[PDB]
Amino acid sequence: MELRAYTVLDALQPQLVAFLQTVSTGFMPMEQQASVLVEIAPGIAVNQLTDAALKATRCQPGLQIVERAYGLIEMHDDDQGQVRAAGDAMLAHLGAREADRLAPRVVSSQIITGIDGHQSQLINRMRHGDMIQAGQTLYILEVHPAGYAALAANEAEKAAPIKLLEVVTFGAFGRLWLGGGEAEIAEAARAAEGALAGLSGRDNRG
Amino acid sequence: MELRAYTVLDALQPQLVAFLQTVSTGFMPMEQQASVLVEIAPGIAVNQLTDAALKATRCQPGLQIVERAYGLIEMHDDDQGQVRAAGDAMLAHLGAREADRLAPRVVSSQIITGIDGHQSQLINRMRHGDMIQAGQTLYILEVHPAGYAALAANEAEKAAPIKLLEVVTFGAFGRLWLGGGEAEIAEAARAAEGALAGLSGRDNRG
Amino acid sequence: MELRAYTVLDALQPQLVAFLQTVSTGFMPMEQQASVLVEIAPGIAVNQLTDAALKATRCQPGLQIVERAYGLIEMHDDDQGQVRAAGDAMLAHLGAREADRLAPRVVSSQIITGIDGHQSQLINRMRHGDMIQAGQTLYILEVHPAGYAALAANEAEKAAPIKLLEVVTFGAFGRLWLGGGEAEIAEAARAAEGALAGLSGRDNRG
Amino acid sequence: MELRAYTVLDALQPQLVAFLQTVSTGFMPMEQQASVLVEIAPGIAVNQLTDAALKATRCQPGLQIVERAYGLIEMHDDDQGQVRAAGDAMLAHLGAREADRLAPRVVSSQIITGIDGHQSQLINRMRHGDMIQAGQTLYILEVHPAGYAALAANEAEKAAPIKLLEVVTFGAFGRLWLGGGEAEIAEAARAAEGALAGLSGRDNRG
Amino acid sequence: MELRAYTVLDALQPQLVAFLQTVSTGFMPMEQQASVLVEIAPGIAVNQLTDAALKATRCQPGLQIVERAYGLIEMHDDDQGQVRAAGDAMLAHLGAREADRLAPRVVSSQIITGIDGHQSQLINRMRHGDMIQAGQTLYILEVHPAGYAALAANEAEKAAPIKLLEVVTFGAFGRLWLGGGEAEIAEAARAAEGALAGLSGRDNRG
Amino acid sequence: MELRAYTVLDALQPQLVAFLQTVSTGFMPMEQQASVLVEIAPGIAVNQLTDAALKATRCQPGLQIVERAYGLIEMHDDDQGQVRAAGDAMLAHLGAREADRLAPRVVSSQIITGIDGHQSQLINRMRHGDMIQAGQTLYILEVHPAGYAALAANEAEKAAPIKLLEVVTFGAFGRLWLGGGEAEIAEAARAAEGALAGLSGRDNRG
């Protein structure tokens, strides 16, 4: 098993919670809960980590995804101590440490101001979070590995009042779409990429 | 055969446009366009109305729904005069005047303040518009016939800064879910209900 | 309890077979097979009919639908005699004769020539059969009860080279959409309507 | 306005829990939790009941369904007393006592032994619970109103080792499909029907 | 950003239009409009191209896809001058020229005559375009990169009267399924592969 | 064309049949039929194999999948002689022999005893076969190439009374989830991996 991504979110922000409540297949997170996300290869082996975390802690799983190649587990609890114990149990099962994850790589990042009404339509049709209106500012981010998109979303939301349009935290690449005012989006993007730049991990230049 | 609902929306507001862009099966509406919605029985006969409107005007259809019993067509254009011409062409084909529609009946209307986070989750999972967060105020409206829900949504959005969560404008009953601050929701609800109460039509008692 | 619709189709035509192969949940029909369709209330009791037919004949079920109120079973075989035997076994279990079905009621029937390209789009998005192009002729039919729509489709296809766009043979109402040239559609519509008008049954007024 | 169905399930059995975990849109139930289900008209007004229950108790909602006409809410908790308190809060908001519900009506009930492999296929394609194999015994039940189907499922599972194939507890009618051995299904069916026949309520004739 | 595919379609043919009207998520194309398709890596960055094209021209976007790795944008207009200006704006944003695209590679190509009725069933179940019947001829094509499948479909349709069954113009590989008569399919395949062979671009031998 | 996987299943076991009846897009298999599965690259070329098998034998196709990169065909018949003739026809078309397939590789394999109720929920939500309950034992297997998962499932089911929860026999990797008692799962896993270890084929160490 290879550790691809590992992140602890100290407190889930309300828009990310509402988004996860929309798309998650397990037990629903609630506002301000702590969360840990672990992405590994091979995919189906993530079930071993879920079992390790559940037998060790009272965390509940919100997301478990076995996709084309990779596997992702998200677990949450009111108490950060429980979420960190769950992460510890999963890392122990892997024989790994936190820094054995891949360092996040920003593949693509752009702020698009004054979006055309035809492009807001395309985003609205695709997204599962909030809607966007013509003339607002759009932030798009693509990251590798995918598991770091949730951290980027949560840190964006902490930093400025923006709208979470879509976050995809599994796949070959992770993706984030935000909408809002120009100044607010610039601050949110600053915070999201700053959070990713500060993480330890294996070289991942692609 | 029967005209159930007829409404002209003078200018589509941005959240209702974003919602319609998400759920519509035809040609996408844009902000501030005019729109006309016509609901009839029997369902498949709405195709006759669509043909009449398209041959007479430049309007484009956003929604055509043939559901269990009823049929709904929505047409839009930049020009209110084109939209009223489309509506008039459809009324003419049906053999009706606007006042032969059913008068809207408010089946249920309620404001729920300070929603619990578990109910926020339920709404987020169901809706196709914006998301709602714990502690916000929810407005819920059920109307008969269903085709009046869009007018209610548009007039609510004009009146106050609220979030459009979900609007269902076809079926046995039409339904509207809005979210936001308490004072804003109270104003939006007054505007929605006032719009429905001012419409002429045939007596439509439960 | 009630026999709503009963039809034996002597030979399934190729476009109707291709459509049924697209939407059916059971065992796929093939070209020129015979078929029997039975619609009853209450819905779940159609399972009793299916069991009776399967224990008595070699027929295979293509469709079994238990919808809001009603239940539909379609069975097919290379041999018309097996299919009539299956239908007879189902009628016997129900306690009925063929003529205890509801006589078909044409709710609406219309030919629309020279369809606008915007209406072609609406039909293409909705349908599960062939596509339609701008300027072609559309036939739309609504029948009650719904289970007679398949007979209408099959007889239409026998009579003229048309395109089967959509046929809905369960629900509160049955619906048929055909496309093609004007003369061809006129002949297909005559054949569909004539097939329904020739069927015995209980008076079924609106 | 109307109370249609009201049931308290003292302890959710493991197959019904696994089924609800598959289809529910809210917070997942767990084995042996208590549950209360309330079905009303009009549909959207179920949101008022959900709010009343959440503000009064610790119960969590598993299902909230606003369908064509009706609304259903299911709430659960480890403690039967919390669940009865939630039900009482909802009855109070509605203005009702438990006995103002509609008495359950068995629309259809049948055991089909030795199912044909073609019918096993049809059931497997439709269901969301366990699978059924050729030659097993099938129990089918249709009840009115729909909200009583869950009680029937839970009591069936308590009484005998059977397989829960499908339970539909909202709509115009509620439906239950069970599979297993002949003697086991006979005992489960007796328990389901006995549970429904023992409930007080308003006369509910067809 | 890497330019993978670039194609200008001078006039969209009616079956391809009907297909795109079925599957597209944006603004619907119409018969005989011009279209430009651009496929790039990384996926989410296609939003930058969409914005560039929309701010420069009056083209409307029919398809915007962000898939596992790649991104695709399609834009159309009545006037080829607008579509070519949109392509120019997108290429300018990329710092690229048309010949910086990958040359198309035919991965697999086959004509299958007299298809068996069991194989026409499989195709009918999968496809989103027209249906196929037993005994007709099938053309299957797989191309790399995927973005060239639309050009192949449009040129096929120009060349001979065939049926467009399915075209997949994004992914790791693009795919095309056509049905019809043997002579017509042979001509359509000739035209489709001839169009791909004539395009400039980077060596792409795989 | 490259032969990736080739397996003949002498007799399909009842749970695998019920699963295939749930997910298959072609002609439904029945209990104890023989089956052959062939996986190749490139994807769309699997249509050539389907045509070869159908023109040579009376087998019927249950599954035909053209996924991101690969193609899979499954064909079945009551008589193993017909299924082996179909496999022979497909291998002859490829110019291949059975041992030209990739040898199966077990990527990941684990037995998880006493599963937590939160993890049984996650499995129940994901799966298409039988349900799993809290405290049961889970077997998870990931294999490469994907086409060998069906053989593993069938051999597991022969070996011990277990529950087939999910089997994914196409993709980059094949996956199998089983549930049941600890001793039964250990025997089923033994049989599944033993079957894969005994197959000839090209070196496939990954």
Experimental method for this entry?
Answer: X-ray
CB-side neighbour CA atoms (13 Å) of D40 = 26
Distance CA B10, CA E152 (A): 44
Task: Please report, in angstroms and rounded to a whole number, the separation of the first and last CA atoms in chain C.
Answer: 20
Q: How distant, in Å, are the alpha carbons of A195, B113, B159, C98, C108 from that of B190?
A: 45, 16, 9, 56, 40
Q: Quick check: D64 contacting A, CB < 8 Å?
A: no
The residue of chain F nearest to residue C30, with distances taken between CA atoms, is F27
Mutate to test the interface with A, among D20, D27, D30, D58 (most CBs of A within 10 A): D27
Q: Which residue reads 């949504």 in tokens?
A: B153
Tokens of D151: 């009680």
What residue type is assigned to position E14 of the chain?
P
Chain C residues inside the 8 Å CB shell of F26: 28
d(CA E166, CA E129) in angstroms, rounded, equals 5
Check if the beta carbon of residue C150 is closer than 8 Å to that of residue C74.
yes
Look at A27 and D27 and tell me if their CB atoms are within 8 Å.
yes
Within 13 Å and on the Cβ side, how many CA atoms surround C16?
A: 26
E116 CB within 8 Å of a chain F CB:
yes
Token output for B85: 């011409």
Hey, which chains touch E, using 3+ CB pairs under 8 Å? A, B, C, F
Residue with tokens 């109070």: D92
Q: Read off the tokens for A54.
A: 């559940």
CA distance B48 to B35: 18
Residue in chain C closest to D175 (alpha carbons) equals C44
CB-nearest to D142 from C25, C44, C64 is C44
Pairing of strands E105-112, E163-168: unpaired
Residues A68, F119: C-beta atoms closer than 8 Å: no
**Secondary structure tally for chain C: helices H, strands E:** 6, 8
Cis peptide before D161 (omega within 30 of 0): no
Q: Do B68 and C172 touch (CB under 8 A)?
A: yes
Contact C26 D138 (CB under 8 A): no
In b/e form, how buried is each residue of E25-38, taking b as 16+ CB within 10 angstroms? bbbbbbbebbbbbb
Dig out the tokens for B45 from the structure.
Answer: 């006969």
> Which residue, A183, A202, A191, A98, is CA-closest to A152?
A191
Neighbours of B93 (CB within 10 A): 16
User: Residues 6 or more apart from C198 whose CB is under 8 A from it?
Assistant: none
Q: To which H or E segment does residue E92 belong? A: helix E80-94
Question: What distance in Å separates the CA atoms of residue C28 and residue D123, rounded to the nearest whole number?
Answer: 16
B120 touching C, CB under 8 A?
no
To which residue do tokens 């949450």 refer? A76
CB of B141 less than 8 A from some CB of D: yes
Q: In the numeric block, which tokens belong to residue C120?
A: 């072609």
Burial degree of C60 (CB within 10 A; 0-12, 13-18, 19+): buried
C197 touches chain F (CB under 8 A): no
How far apart (Å, rounded) are the C-alpha atoms in residues C14 and A116?
47
* CB D104 within 8 Å of CB D204: yes
How many residues are recorded in chain C?
Answer: 206
Nearest-neighbour CA in chain A from F170: distance (Å)? 10
Q: In D57-181, which residue ranges form alpha helices assigned H by DSSP?
A: 80-94, 117-126, 149-159
Position of tokens 């790795």?
E69
- Cβ separation of A26 and D28 shorter than 8 Å? yes
CATH of span D1-102: 3.30.70.1710
Which uninterrupted H or E stretch holds E72?
A: strand E71-77
Are E142 and F45 an interchain contact pair (Cβ–Cβ within 8 Å)? yes
Q: Is C131 on the interface with E (CB under 8 A)?
A: yes
Give E3 to chain C, closest Cα distance, Å. 31
Residue B58, class by beta-carbon neighbours within 10 Å (0-12 exposed, 13-18 middle, 19+ buried)?
A: middle
Q: Do B and F count as touching (3 or more CB pairs closer than 8 A)?
A: no
DSSP H or E stretch at residue E49: helix E46-56
Name the phi and psi angles at B52, rounded to 5. Answer: -60, -45
Structure token digits, residue E48: 């930058």
Phi, psi of C168 (to 5 degrees): -115, 110
Query: Pick from B44, B50, B64: which is nearest to C142 by CB?
Result: B44
The shortest CB-CB distance from F44 to any of E118, E121, E175 is to E175
Beta carbons within 10 angstroms of residue D177's beta carbon: 24
Peptide bond between residue C29 and the one before it cis (omega within 30 degrees of 0): no
Q: Which residues pair with D108 in a beta bridge?
A: D142
Q: Is residue F51 less than 8 Å (CB to CB) from chain D?
A: no
Q: Chains meeting D at 3+ CB pairs closer than 8 A? A: A, B, C, F
The b-or-e profile of E155-172 (16+ CB within 10 A means b, else e) is: bbbebbebbbbbbbbbbb
Interface test with E, best of C15, C16, C28, C121 (most E CBs within 10 A): C121
Provide the sign of the torsion angle of the four alpha carbons E149, E150, E151, E154, taken in this order.
positive
Q: Which of residues 4-33 of F touch C (CB under 8 A)?
A: 26-28
Contacts of E25 in chain C (CB under 8 A): none
Q: Does D69 touch chain B (CB under 8 A)?
A: yes
Query: Other CB atoms closer than 10 Å to residue D206's CB: what's the count?
Result: 7
CB contact under 8 A, A26 and D27: no
**Contact assignment for D69 to B173 by CB distance below 8 Å:** yes
| E-chain residues near F89 (CB < 8 A) | none
**Which candidate, E173, E145, E141, places its Cα nearest to that of E5?**
E145
Q: Distance between CA E74 and CA E67 in Å, rounded?
A: 14
- Tell me, yes or no, whether chains A and C touch by having 3 or more C-beta pairs under 8 A: no
Flag whether D touches E (3+ CB pairs, 8 A cutoff).
no
Q: CB-side exposure of B70: number of CA atoms within 13 Å?
A: 21
Do the chains contact at F47 and E110, CB–CB below 8 Å? yes
Q: At what angle do helices B14-23 and B149-159 cross, to 10 degrees?
A: 140
Cβ-based contacts of B45 with chain C (< 8 Å): 108, 110, 140, 142
A81 neighbors F139 (Cβ within 8 angstroms): no
Answer whether F129 sits within 8 Å of D131, measured CB to CB.
Answer: yes
CATH architecture of C103-206: 2-Layer Sandwich (3.30)
Whether E68 sits inside 8 A of A172 (CB atoms) is: yes
Provide the residue type at B65 as one letter.
Answer: I
**Residue written as tokens 């035919």?**
E106
State the SS3 of chain A: CEEEEEEEECCCCHHHHHHHHHHCCCCCCCCCCEEEEEEEECHHHHHHHHHHHHHHCCCEEEEEEECCCCEEEEEEECCHHHHHHHHHHHHHHHCCCHHHCECCEEEEEEEECCCCHHHHHHHHHHCCCCCCCCCCEEEEEEEECHHHHHHHHHHHHHHCCCEEEEEECCCCCEEEEEEECHHHHHHHHHHHHHHHHCCCCECCCC
Spell out which residues of chain F touch residue E108, defining contact as CB-CB under 8 Å: 1, 42, 44-45
CA distance linking residue E4 with residue E190, whole number of Å: 24
Using CA coordinates, name the residue in chain C closest to F61: C28
**H helix or E strand, kind and range, residue B55:** helix B46-56
Residue C144, beta-bridge partner list:
C105
**Closest partner residue to C64 among D122, D138, D142, by Cβ?**
D122
Cβ–Cβ below 8 Å for C25 and D172: no
d(CA B133, CA F117): 28
Residue D145 CA, distance from chain mean position: 11
Given an 8 Å threshold on Cβ–Cβ distance, is B27 in contact with E28?
yes
Q: This structure's resolution (angstroms)?
A: 1.5
Cα–Cα distance for residue pair D90/D92, rounded to 1 Å: 5
SS3 string of F109-145?
EEEECCCCHHHHHHHHHHCCCCCCCCCCEEEEEEEEC
Which of C37, C73, C79, C39 lies closest to C57, judged by CA?
A: C79
- Rounded to the nearest 10°, the torsion over CA E189, E193, E195, E201 is 160
Q: Which of F88, F86, F66, F77 is nearest to F27 (CA)?
A: F77
User: In angstroms, what separates the C-alpha of E94 from chain A's closest C-alpha?
Assistant: 13
Q: Which long-range contacts (CB under 8 A, 24 or more apart) does D95-100 make?
A: D96/D3, D98/D6, D98/D200, D99/D200, D99/D201, D99/D202, D100/D3, D100/D201, D100/D202
Q: Which of these, E11, E15, E7, lies nearest to E160 by C-alpha position?
A: E15
- Provide long-range contacts, Cβ within 8 A and 24+ apart, for B51-56: B51/C112, B51/C115, B51/C116, B51/C119, B52/B89, B52/B90, B52/B92, B52/B93, B53/B86, B53/B87, B53/B89, B53/B90, B54/C116, B54/C118, B54/C119, B55/B89, B55/C116, B56/B85, B56/B86, B56/B89
Q: Any CB–CB contact under 8 A between C126 and chain B?
A: yes
Instruction: Find out whether E77 and E34 touch, Cβ atoms under 8 Å.
Output: yes
Preferred mutation among C25, C44, C57 to probe D, highest tally of D CBs within 10 A: C44
Chain A residues whose beta carbon lies within 8 Å of the beta carbon of residue F177: 44
Which regions of chain A carry the CATH code 3.30.70.1710?
1-102, 103-206
Distances in Å between the Cα of A49 and the Cα atoms of A179, C131, F173 are 35, 49, 20
Q: Which residues pair with E174 in a beta bridge?
A: E143
F101 contacts F201 by C-beta, under 8 angstroms = yes
- The nearest CA of chain F is from the CA of C59 a distance in Å of 14
